[PDB]
Structures are given as C-alpha cells and as structure tokens.
C-alpha cells in the first residue's frame, strides 16, 4: 500500500528527547513542532530515523534543535500542504548546529512559503530552485552562513541545472539533487523515464500513469479528483460514521479546541457558515431567517498581522470586537486577505490601520458596510496611522454610526479622503483633528485639473506646447517636465523645470508655455508627462494641474557604416559578407552595394627578381507677502550597383580569377545613405594562362649556343613576370635558368651558354603572379666536345 | 474673471476710476484672495 | 546757512501731478510717497526740480511713476535716516516702469533700514554701486530688474573709483557721476576733495573740512553736535520747551487723529512717557507712585508682527491688550530689531501664535515675557507653533513663563527635549493632551540625542582607527552607526558618510566588542573633524533619540614630500653661481630642510680634438519585519502556565669656487623629517674667463729654403681641457688679410702652424686661440718673407 | 539588566529552568518591552 | 544646459520659423550667449 | 569601497597587530576578496 500508516494528530516535540517516537505515520494531520532541543549533539541524533512520513498538512516548524541534517529524520517527505500556515509560511527553520537540509523527496508546497533564517551554520541553500517546488516564488531567506561565503560549493557528482536570475546554475545535498520533471507533468510528477504520473497524484508516483501523494483527494488506495462516496480537512474523505463519531466524542470529551463537525456539501467541515444551520444526518440547511456569525475576540481586539491571523476570522460575517491591520511584510499579500476577510459585513468595534506597508489598496473588505460601539482613544471609530494608495467608492455603501484620523499617508490623495468623509455620512459632524493634517499625497497629489496644444518633432529636437492654466490667484511657481524613452509605451524621467511666461492681461492674447528638448536620438520613442507646482496654503490647498502621459517617436536620419569581408566561392565568383552597422537610426530600407576592380602592381609586371640563394517657496512667498503689504497700505478705502534588404551577404560573379576587386557598400534607411564602406579580396586564380602556349623548339649555333622558341601569354592579369626553364643532361642531374622579361628582352628568348658538352633536354614553364604553371613539351640540344 | 490678484489690481484700477484717482487721508484680503465687486471696488479709488 | 529751508511734514504725492510743489525743504520730517503717477512722460517730468532737499527722516517711497531719473528731482539728497521703516527698508523703488537711472549722486548714508529696488522692468546700472560705504547693513534685496537679463550695456562716467565686490574689483551709477569714496578713518563724517576728514558730528558731506551738510547725531542750530546742551525732537534735533508744549497743546486743540501729546522726558520731546513714568506744568515725566502699565490695545485684539514696521507699533509697550502672531517671511534673520521693539513686553493678554517664521532661529527676544489665556486659538489654545527653522525656543532658567489657561507641529529644527521642558515649566503638567504635544515632524534633523558616546584612537599617514564605547537601546532596535568625518584645517566647524552595522551582541557586558572603523586612504599631515551618530527604529509612543558623540579633531602623520618644482641655476660670477627653485607641489608636512648637492659634469670628449675648421523607510520595513517575527515566535512557542647643505625657508642659495665654463650638476632633496623625496636635478653653464683663451707666449718665425714658414708657440691646456683649434691671421704689406684655420689635427701634422703656397712678398702673421668659450686675445705679430 | 529582549530570552531561559524545560498544553509584551521578574519568568518555563 | 551654437541654431530656427523666413539688412551675441527660449530665437522671423 | 590588496594590507595589519606578531606555518583569499573588518584581518595575529 502507498499509505503504510495512520494519522499522528498534532505532534509537538519539546524540551528533552523525551516523548517523540510516536513512527510509520505517513500523514500527520496537524503541524510538526520539534524545537527547544537545547542539549543534543550529532551523536545523539544520527541513528534515529522516521523514513515513512510522506504527508504534512499544515506546516513543519523547527526552532533551535545538535542536529546534523534532516535527511535521516525525514528522508521520504514529499509535500507540505500548508492549509494552516504558521505566520505566512509552511517551512520555517529558524535559529544552530546543522550540516544540510537533505529532504531529497520534498516536491511541492501547496499554499505558503519558506522562511529559513538566522541559521549561523547553514549553506547550500542558494543552489536550490524553488520554481518547480513552490507555488509562490515570492521565500524570505537571510542571515545564514551562506551569506558570508564561508561555505564552498558542493554538489553530488551529474546533476541537473536551471537558470536563476539569468544565471544557469546547478540545483542540495552531497548525494542527491533536485528531481526535475517535465513541465507538462505539472505537479503530477514523473518517473526515471520521464513518463508523467497520473494527474491525481502529487509529486511522485510509484509507477507511471496510476501515487505517493494525491493532488486533490485520496479516497482509498488511489488518488481522485473528488470522492464519490456519500470531505475531511480538504485532503481526504471519510464515511459519515467517522465524522459523527468525532463530533460526539469531542463534546463528550469536553476537550477545548474541537469543532463539532457538521456535514455540509458532502464535506465534514467544522461548522456551517453564516447562512446555514447545524443539526439527525446533520446536513447544514439554509437558515429560516437571518443567522449571523459574531466571532468574539480576545477582549474585543485582534491584530490582523499575517495570514495566520486572518484565518482566525475566515467565514466570519460579524466581528464582535475591534480589528487592527498591522501587516509589516514586504510582499503585498492581497489575495489571502480577500478570501479570509472578504465575507465580513461590519465591525461592531472600532477599526484601525497602522504600519500596513504591504497594502496598496483596501478593497479586500468587499462587504464591509457598517459600528461605533467601541472607540479609539479620543472617541474615534476609525484610524489611519506609507504605501496606501486607493475603498473604491460606488453603490458600495459604507456608513458609520458614531465616532470620527488620517495621518502619515504619503501615497493617499486628499480627494479620496474627502469622498470617504462625504459618503460615510460624517458631513457636518467632523473636526479638523478627524481630517488629515500630516503629509497626505506628498508624491501622489493627483491634481484634479487636466493639461497639450502644439507638438513638433525633429531628429534631434522636439517641441511641445500646452495650454496655460493659472491657479485661482495668479502662486504658480512654474512647470517641471518629465520625459524618458518608452520603447513600447509600457510605462526615471529627465527633470527640467521652466518658469511660466509673462502673464497677459487678456486671456485671448495669452502666451502658451513651450519647451524644446534638444539633442535627442533619431527614430527613438519617448514618454512625456508634465506637472504644475503651486505654493502651499494650509487652509486653501490647491493641487495644481496634471497632463496625461503621451508617447512620441523621433524622425529618422542617415544610418552608420555597416560593420565587411569578401570570400570567393569560385574563380570568377565571389560571395560578399558584412554585419549590420553599429546603430541603424531607423529600420534599414536597403543596403546599397557597388563593385569595382583594382589594378595590379605595374612595377612587378616587368622588373626582375630571379636572384636565388522650501528654499525657493520662502523666496517667492516673501515676494507675494510684500505686494500684499504695499497694496493694503497704498490703497486706502473711503559602377554597377544593387540593393540588399534584410540580408548580410551577396554573390558576385563574372570577375577575373586573381585580379583584386573592390566593393563599395552604402547603408540607407530612406527610399539617404551612410558614408562609403569599402572592402577588397583576392580570389583563387586559374592555371589555364599559367601554362605556356605552344611547345618548345630548339636551334643550335656554331658556338654551342641554344635558342628556344615559344609564344608569350599576356592573359594572366597582364604581363607575365618571368619564366622558369629546366634542363638536364643524359644520365645527370637537373639544371635551371631563371628567365625574366629582362633576360627575354636581352636574348630575344631563353638562351643557354657555357654548358658542358653532352646531350640535354630543356623544358620551359611560365610563372605568373598566381604561381608556376604547367610545363611544356621538352626539346633537346647538344654541345660539341 | 474679476480675480484681481497681485499686479492685476494696479493695471485694472485705472480702468475703474481715474477721474479722481484714489482717495487718501485692506484690499488684498477682500479682492485678491476672493472675488471683488464693482459695488466695493470703486471705494478704493475714491 | 547749511539749512536753507524748513520742515515739510508728511508729504504724499498721489494721483495726478496736482498738489506737490510744496520747495526749499531741506528736511522732510516724515516719509515721501510719490506714487501712482499713471499718466506722465519724460516731457512732463524733465524741467521740474527740487535741488535743496538734503535730509529725509523715515523713508522715500516710489511706486509706479513716465519719469526718467531722480537726478533732477532730488539732485542733492544725502542721507535717509530711516527711523521709521516702510516694511523693513528706507528706500523702496518698486515697479516704476519708465526710468533712465537712479541718479542721486549726493546720497551718502542710510542709518537704519535697507534698500529694496525691485521689479523695475527698465532698470540697469544697479550692480555697479557699492553699498559697503553707504549702507549700515550689507544684508539689500534687489531682484527682477532689467539688469538681470543683461540687456543693458556697461556705462560709467569717463576716471571713476573702483572697489571689490564678491572678490571682483569692479568700478562703482550715472553717466556723469559715480561714488564719492571717503577714507575709512573718516567714517560717516565724510571727506572733501583733498581727502580731509569732515568734522565728526557732520554726516556724509561737509561744506568745508573740520567744521556740515548733514549732522551725524543732532543738529542744535547752524552746526552739528553730539547732544544739545540747551535745556530732543524725533531723534535728530532739539527745540525749546515752548515749541514742544505748543505742539502738545495744538494737536489736542486741533483734535487731529495721529498726534501724540508730547511730554518732556530726559530732556527729550518724546511722544509719551513709557511704562514707569507719568505725564504732566513743565511736563517732566516722573516715576509712577505705584504700578503704571501700558496696555497697548490692538485692532480687534489681534496684530501681525511680520516685519520691523509692525514691531515698531509695539515699542515701549509692556502689556498687549490683544493677541499677537509672529509671521516673519523673510530670508534675513532680523533678530536685533525684535529684541529692541518687543523685549520690553511683559505678558500677552490674548493668545500667542507663531507661523511660517523662517527668519527666527531662537525665541529669546521676548526677554521679559512671563505671563494670559483670556483669548484662545481655535480648539481652545493659548499658544501655537505652525510650520521649520526654529531651533532653541526660550532659554529655560529662573526666567519664569507660566500660562493661566489654554493648551507644536511642523517644527523640523525643534528638538523634543526643549518642547517637553517648556511643557513642564509652563505649569501645564497634568492638564495636557496628545493634541497639545507634538505629533508632526519635530527634530527631524535636530534630534540632539540625550546620550553621549570614544575609547581607542589610532592614526596613520593614510589610515585612522577610531574605537568608541558600545551603547545599546533599551531593547537590543539599533540599526547601526553612521559616521561623518571631513577635513577641518583649523577646527572651525559636508562630511563623508559611511554606515556600519553593529558587531554581534555579547551576552556578557564585560566581554563586549567595541565597534571600530578604519577610514583608509587619507592625506598625510592633514587634519579632520569627526562626529558619529546612532540610528534606532521609530516607536511613536516610545520615541528614542539614540546616542551622540562630540566632534573631535585629529591630524594625520607626515610622510616624504614631493620633488621640488622648476629648479634653475644662474651664475652671478665666473666662479660663482646662484641656484633657484620654487617649492614642490605638495609638502605633505612643513618642510624641515631642503637638502642640496653639487656635482660637476665633464665636457664633450669628441669635440676636444676633432677638426671642424671647414668654412664657406525602505530598510525599516525590512528590519522591523524581523523584530515582529521573533516576537510572534516567542509569544507562540512560550506558553505560560659630494658636498651637501641644508636650506630652510629659502628658495635660493649661492655656490662658489667652480670652473668658469664647465657645466655643473646640482642634486636637490626635499625633506620633512630630521626622510627626503627622490632626487631633483639641474645644470647650468656659467660665463667663462678669457685668461686661458689667450695664447701663452708670443709668436716667433722660421723660414726654410722652399719659402715654408714655421711658427713657434706654447699650447694652453687650461680652458676646460684640450683646446679645440687655433685661428691664424696674416696680411701682406699693403694688401688684404689672409687666414689659416689651425686645429689640433693640423697642429699634429705640421708640428705647428705652417703656411705654404703664399705669393712672394712681406707678411706679418698673428695667432689667436679659440677654446670652447670662443676666440681669445691675439698674440704678438711675427713676420716672414717669400722669395720672388 | 534583566532586559531579556529578542534572542536574549532563548539564551537565558535555560539559565532559569531546565529541569522540566518549558510547559506546553504572551512573553514579549511583558518581559521584552519591559523588565521581567523571577516571580513571573519561571512560569513561562513551567 | 542644452547650449549650442552656429549650425545647431541655424537649423533649429527651422523648427519654429521654417516657412516664415528671416529678416535681412547679430544672432550670435543674442542667442549663442546662453539658453534660448522661443521668444529670443523667433525675433528674426516673427 | 576602500578595497585594497597586497602591500596595502601588509602594512595595514601593523595598525592593529604591529607588536603582536603573525602566525607562520592564505590571507589573499580571505581579506583581499572584499571589504575587511577588524575581526577578519586580525585573524593572523590574535
């Protein structure tokens, strides 16, 4: 069987190693608190092992255990279901002696997170990938020994590797690593062959397509989506008899903490919610009238600091006491609060919000509608005492009965506060203490006035003109502008402040403020928004004006030079190659290319080388103060070319075999090109012209002087530099004469003098700029003894 | 408009009364921080 | 007479050019308001002139005047006394659209007040005036004029004097006149064209030296005096008792509003006797026979103290019958005037409020404010502090300030300790709420921690080690220590900022770890100032300041200095030289001595013999999260039941006893410990001597049979070694001159100078030596003959 | 001292009662934000 | 900053007065000397 | 920053352990790799 043991409800190991040993429990049905093991050493904690615990429902908590590793304590634990979290997490290992985590069977943490911290002897934790393990990738792990780089890298082997933060790194023991399953397998798991496990399984399967753990429910001896027997703890099903037996037993046992289980929706849930009634088959039926919840609290006050505190009020509709929201975590944590508290209706006590950084809005109170039975100090039934930004005011009715605080809310605007004051029904019964006096909307003013008239763009300059708006009293310090590149309008901006133009006494003949942001990149797009600054009047607060963010794109110009080589594929055929330029300055319409031929070396054609061997507000306000004093006093009342597009290569044919060729390349983005780009090459020649035309004939004079007769080829890239002549006596070695154009001119052909008497045969070979060609037919000559 | 604030009053008072100018033997608190009226504005210019 | 006219009490020109013309008035006795001249052009305002107004007491005000300049309206105005200011100033020329220039080439001194020319869209030539010799207070708010945009070119008469402003020596206000600078010893008395100081009691200018156009203190009659000895009016002159009593009787007979029934006190015809004396039959103020208050009633029991003119409304007052609000919105602190005007107050019967008081740094000018709550601010409050530079509040001492009834926001520079002490001494203990106490930012940059912090100090030429005792907050909240240190050349205290986390906590206070830091890479010999601070988490109901350390000054140890820069050596005599250099780039400590060497360099060996004779909150929510968690854990898991020499302070020396032309080498070391720098080198070439340049011994001649001539002389080897060559000259009888360039090579070939191939005749030949220095003296001629 | 705040409580509780460790079926608000006493501290360790 | 001179202004004036034209009988001492707003660089075209 | 290596630290250890002496049988991989506090650079002298 896949479940060789029963439940082990609510284990908690504390003080000495005494107790514990309570074995074979594959499922826990509760949490696991092994902590305060103040006196042990790895000798005391090396042989003890519980290899057959596979399923932990709520969380596993360890706090200051002389323990080397958990790889022997829990070698085959796979999933922490995390239905009931500790603070916000399901795996909290906090604060001395250790070797490594182990736990090479753990696969999935359904709901929760991991919070390993302050373990002064812990490393090998950054070498684990949580993407395939944790539902929520946003896992607070700090203040461990791996932070100071005192622990060298060790991995078994050989082991897989993933990419974290753009770095492809291997993924937690000295003998085991992560068991990566295919993405199509999801949480079902995989075998050694990569076969996906059956869908209802969870983490691992003994055999493919049939399970160590169940994804949704267990039933009996298998994994199912939902039990069809006529639900317990969101993970399994039991018969009605067991549920009613527990219900009767715990009320018979009088044990504190039990919930008298009542069947509802074929689930053995603790109690019927607000809307149904408990019971003779104990099926929760809808109430014959209003049935509230009224979840009483400790002294009528509770702190909603995290998920574990919110779960204390799940299903509640009425709070018999007060509530304070004190979330002090970096992660926003918005979804869980909506589920846990969204079903609330009214707070009979007072409400308070303090240091709720994670909150951005306050919408999770989706049904909070109505009391002032209890008041904060100073007789207040509400409170707000650095990231709050948005209730959504609509037909959604929120009114207070009695009571009357908005302080230190930098991201909260004044308009929403005033609208809340109005809709609350507090009109005519509020004082200035109730209204906000501390910084509200310091960076989130959100001016209620809108601001553009004339837009003109250029490749380096952009002109924007917008309608002039004056405050009620002609206070306006000026306009500061923000604009930055927006490649895809997916919106850090530049900051320039401009004083307003001179005031015009006639509104018709006003001067529209304008600006030029010069020196901008051509073809680039940007996002612009502008703002207004006014002097602060405490009793006459004025927001100013705002302009919507707009996106414009610069005009294009000439591109840059492409960044070029040419390689020949055939004797008369060459293939061009180059890379795109550094900056296109706009999508390149076409790459204009030319081809050109370059002459050879004229000197080498004939020459012989045959030799061998507040700062400004007070300044402006002082100016407004004076003019008021003045008026109050002095006014007493009564070459061939081609275009390439989207290709970094080309082929040119019909060229000489070895003569160098020149290519001129232009990059153009309008059909406007760049400056010239040039490149040359030298193709592989042909040996047809390297061979001397016509065989060699011989003539003999009286003085044993030999003259040879052949024709000069002038095809191989022009004049031939020289010839090579070979001759050998009968039965002797070989002799050579290096014949150049100069010697050919002197002797009107190759001539041999001073040779020893005997019989010879002489051959002639041409040598062009390419090299030495084929040899000619031999001819003979004789020298008299 | 009629929100004669700041340098607007000096430029607008001679479009109200200039025959006798302005009487001599306040103004900002009642026609600069709010809206003044022709019933009360001409007093400040005799 | 120096005063050709009478007073012109309280002139005010308004509307059209009508009125005015009220001439010869040298003194004004009041202010001068010429304003709202809406329709004029320079044609209407060119010929009119009042050239004999010399003395203005309170202030001159011009507001929106078609007027070119004041040089014709007031050509001879010298001093504005400024006893009664307009707002804070005595010369306010505002928004007068049309103009050419200020003029006023006679104005000398403004006693008390300032100048506030502004918003004149056609004004320039104002930055070319020096106010140091003109204005008592150099701290003259002038902005928003045409000269700001540089649309007006520089024009000065001529020729005219020039002073230094902002480190720039610039000329000092018309096209024909400029500032009349007097010697500093003359003070405000003035000077004549010869520079002679005017008589002390004069003011500004004097008709003749040492006897005045204006009087410094008092006038008396036809002269200037320190104080009238006749048996004082308006702080500037004296009159007989008859005139003062005549005014006193007349104004109460005339029933004219504004008069003060003048009563004689201390031989002064002051308006009224102050709090302590009684008015009266010779009307001399005698001390009261009992308590006599002032009780200066105010408009609807509320007044605004915004500037000097408002404060002067309450001078001499001891009791304020209404409320008071302090609303100073000016950059300048303006502390002295408030102490004089309001320091004699005793208690405010109404409420008190302070709002937007930038200029205030402390609140000590209420030197006798001791006691009411008869009127209250909204919310029933008899005190207020609304909104950024207040730093001290009262100086708490035996000085008693207590309130009767009634009950602090936006005070970044006000500490909490002073606020709490004020709350305690006020007698408000046990009758205050949190609204009364400060909830807004107080002491944001001025926390002034009530705890003191150094243990071990170690210095090095580039590193300094500081160690200080560890202080932990009540709950072991401490984010860490951030340090500030910057150079303090004279400890006359912008600092560098480095934040350090605390060391690990020790369970035993005896075995704690003292936090320490090393600021590395510091300049040697330099001194710095250091101060360190502590940062704690903010608890609203448990505010903790942290700890503070006093600023300390240390100076780095010295090292080797740099190479002395630009050394040159110039010889004063043939055997004497004078070296020169200027100090190195960085001394790295006061230089103890400049070590110098001298050395000789050899000549060119090749030139000695070779012939060349050829010619032609982000982290708080991070840390507070970790304190929150551990609280949750414990609350859950703990269930209850070469010769050398040293030069000092001199960039020169003399070295003698050297060769006349041989090059010499100098090695210079700069040292700051007696530890020197690397070598500094320099050479020179002194002027030679011609003694060795002359050939020793006269020239003799010998003649051979083949007309070959041999000359006999001795070789000098003294001039810097071997002589390079000789010069030989010979001339036939009655003919031109001929020369032979004899070198060492030719001398070796012919064993002396020899002449061959010369034409027959009679000759005389002379020989001259030519050393490396040059050609020396010639020798005695000798003759030779060639046979025909 | 006796201001057992934060990690001080865990390191000091075994210097108070370790014979039976700590009772199981708050602490910060009364011995971490203030001064605890030996009369009330030993209860938290049974 | 955004200060420029010469060619930069001669094709910058095109942005505000490209089709307006320019007066002909020094812009260097009026506009190159500092930052230029529209009112200063448009003086030659109107 | 204040990061250095080699001779800088070989003369810096004199500041805290000049007269203490140093152990002899790598400081480069322990101290030159990053910013060094007193506890790390004093390990070789104690």
Curated annotation (Swiss-Prot), chain A:
In UniProt terms, what is the effect of altering residue 91 to Q? In LEPRCH; inhibits receptor processing
Q: What is the effect of changing residue 137 to L?
A: In IRAN type A
Name this protein carries in UniProt = Insulin receptor subunit alpha
Phosphotyrosine sites (modified residues)? 357
Q: What is the effect of changing residue 243 to Y?
A: In LEPRCH; abolishes post-translational processing
Q: Where is this region: Insulin-binding?
A: 627-635
Q: Which gene encodes it?
A: INSR
Effect on the protein of changing residue 116 to M: In LEPRCH; mild
Result when mutating residue 717 to S: In RMS; impairs post-translational processing
Q: Impact of altering residue 182 to L?
A: In Ins resistance; severe
Q: What is the effect of changing residue 764 to T?
A: In LEPRCH; abolishes post-translational processing; abolishes insulin binding
- The SS bond pairs are 8-25, 123-151, 159-177, 181-190, 185-196, 197-205, 201-211, 214-223, 227-237, 243-268, 250-258, 272-284, 287-291, 295-316, 413-446, 610-738, 668-673
The reported effect of residue 661 to C is: In LEPRCH; abolishes post-translational processing
From Swiss-Prot, chains B, D, E, F:
Specify whether RNA-binding is a keyword of the entry.
Answer: no
List the SUPFAM superfamilies hit by this protein, alphabetically.
Insulin-like
Q: Where in the cell is it found?
A: Secreted
Which ranges does the record mark as transmembrane? none
Main localization, broad class: secreted
For this protein, the record's PROSITE patterns field holds: INSULIN
Q: Which GO terms describe its biological process?
A: cellular response to oxygen-containing compound; glucose homeostasis; glucose metabolic process; positive regulation of protein secretion
What is a single molecular function from GO for this protein?
A: hormone activity
Disulphide-bridged cysteine pairs: 5-32, 17-45, 31-36
> Which function does this protein serve?
Insulin decreases blood glucose concentration. It increases cell permeability to monosaccharides, amino acids and fatty acids. It accelerates glycolysis, the pentose phosphate cycle, and glycogen synthesis in liver.
Q: How does it assemble?
A: Heterodimer of a B chain and an A chain linked by two disulfide bonds.
Q: Which PANTHER family match?
A: INSULIN (PTHR11454:SF9), INSULIN/INSULIN GROWTH FACTOR (PTHR11454)
Q: What is this protein called?
A: Insulin
Organism listed in the record? Balaenoptera physalus (Fin whale)
């Amino acid at each position: 069987h896949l479940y060789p043991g029963e439940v082990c409800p609510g284990m908690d190991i504390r003080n000495n190693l005494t107790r514990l040993h309570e074995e074979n429990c594959s499922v826990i049905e509760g949490h696991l608190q092994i902590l305060l093991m103040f006196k042990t050493r790895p000798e005391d904690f090396r042989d003890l092992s519980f290899p057959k615990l596979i399923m932990i429902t709520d969380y596993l908590l360890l706090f200051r255990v002389g323990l080397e590793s958990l790889k022997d304590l829990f070698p085959n634990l796979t999933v922490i279901r995390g239905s009931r979290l500790f603070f916000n997490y399901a795996l909290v290992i906090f604060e001395v002696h250790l070797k490594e985590l182990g736990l090479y069977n753990l696969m999935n943490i359904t709901r929760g997170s991991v919070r390993i911290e302050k373990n002064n002897e812990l490393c090998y934790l950054a070498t684990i990938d949580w993407s395939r393990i944790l539902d929520s990738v946003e896992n607070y792990i700090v203040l461990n020994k791996d932070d100071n780089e005192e622990c060298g890298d060790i991995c078994p082997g050989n082991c897989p590797a993933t990419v974290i933060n753009g770095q492809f790194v291997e993924r937690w023991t000295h003998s085991h690593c992560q068991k990566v399953c295919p993405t199509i397998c999801k949480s079902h798991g995989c075998t050694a062959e990569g076969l996906c496990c059956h869908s209802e399984c969870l983490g691992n399967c003994s055999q493919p397509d049939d399970c160590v753990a169940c994804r949704n429910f267990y039933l009996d001896g298998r994994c199912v989506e939902t039990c069809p027997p006529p639900h317990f703890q969101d993970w399994r099903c039991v018969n009605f008899s067991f549920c009613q037996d527990l219900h009767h037993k715990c009320k018979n046992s009088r044990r504190q903490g039990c919930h008298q289980y009542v069947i509802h929706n074929n689930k053995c849930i603790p109690e019927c919610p607000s809307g149904y009634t408990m019971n003779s088959n104990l099926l929760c039926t809808p109430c014959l009238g209003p049935c509230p919840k009224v979840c009483h609290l400790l002294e009528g006050e509770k702190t909603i600091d995290s998920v574990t505190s919110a779960q204390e009020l799940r299903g509640c509709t009425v709070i018999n006491g007060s509530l304070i929201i004190n979330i002090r975590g970096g992660n926003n944590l918005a979804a869980e609060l909506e589920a846990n508290l969204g079903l609330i209706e009214e707070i009979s006590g007072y409400l308070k919000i303090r240091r709720s950084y994670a909150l951005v809005s306050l919408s999770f109170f989706r049904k909070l509608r109505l009391r002032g039975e209890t008041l904060e100090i100073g007789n207040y039934s509400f409170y707000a005492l650095q990231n709050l930004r948005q209730w959504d005011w609509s037909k959604h009715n929120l009114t207070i009965t009695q009571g009357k605080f908005f302080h230190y809310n930098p991201k909260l605007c004044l308009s929403e506060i005033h609208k809340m004051e109005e809709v609350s029904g507090t009109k005519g019964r509020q004082e200035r203490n109730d209204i906000a006096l501390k910084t509200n909307g310091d960076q989130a003013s959100c001016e209620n006035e809108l601001l553009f008239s004339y837009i003109r763009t250029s490749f380096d300059k952009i002109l924007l003109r917008w309608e002039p708006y004056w405050p009620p009293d002609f206070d306006l310090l000026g306009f500061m502008l923000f604009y930055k590149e927006a490649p895809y309008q997916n919106v850090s901006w530049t900051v320039v402040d401009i004083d307003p133009p001179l005031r015009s006494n006639d509104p018709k003949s006003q001067n529209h403020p304008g600006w030029l942001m010069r020196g901008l990149k051509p073809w680039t797009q940007y996002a612009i928004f502008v703002k207004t600054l006014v002097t602060f009047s405490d009793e006459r607060r004025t927001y100013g004006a705002k302009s919507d963010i707009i996106y414009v794109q610069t005009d294009a110009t000439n591109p840059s030079v492409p960044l070029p080589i040419s390689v020949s594929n055939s004797s008369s055929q060459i293939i061009l190659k180059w890379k795109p330029p550094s900056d296109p300055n706009g999508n390149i319409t076409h790459y204009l290319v030319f081809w050109e031929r370059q002459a050879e070396d004229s000197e080498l054609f004939e020459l012989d080388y045959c030799l061998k061997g507040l700062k400004e507000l007070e300044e402006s306000s002082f100016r407004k103060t004076f003019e008021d004093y003045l008026h109050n006093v002095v006014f007493v009342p009564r070459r061939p070319f081609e275009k390439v597009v989207n290709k970094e290569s080309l082929v040119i044919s019909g060229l000489r075999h070895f003569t160098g060729y020149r290519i001129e390349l232009q990059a153009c983005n309008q059909d406007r090109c760049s400056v010239a780009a040039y490149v040359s090459a030298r193709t592989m020649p042909e040996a047809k012209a390297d061979d001397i035309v016509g065989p060699v004939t011989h003539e003999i004079f009286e003085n044993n002087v030999v003259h040879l007769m052949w024709q000069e080829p002038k095809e191989p890239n022009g004049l031939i530099v020289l010839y090579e002549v070979s001759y050998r006596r009968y039965g002797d070695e070989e002799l050579h004469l290096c014949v150049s154009r100069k010697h050919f001119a002197l002797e009107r052909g190759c001539r041999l003098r001073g040779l020893s008497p005997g019989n010879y045969s002489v051959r002639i070979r041409a040598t062009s700029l390419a090299g030495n060609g084929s040899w000619t037919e031999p001819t003979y000559f004789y020298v008299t003894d | 408009n009629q929100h004669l604030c700041g340098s607007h009053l000096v430029e607008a008072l001679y479009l109200v009364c200039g025959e006798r100018g302005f009487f001599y033997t306040g103004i900002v608190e009642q026609c600069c921080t709010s809206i003044c009226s022709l019933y009360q504005l001409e007093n400040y210019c005799n």
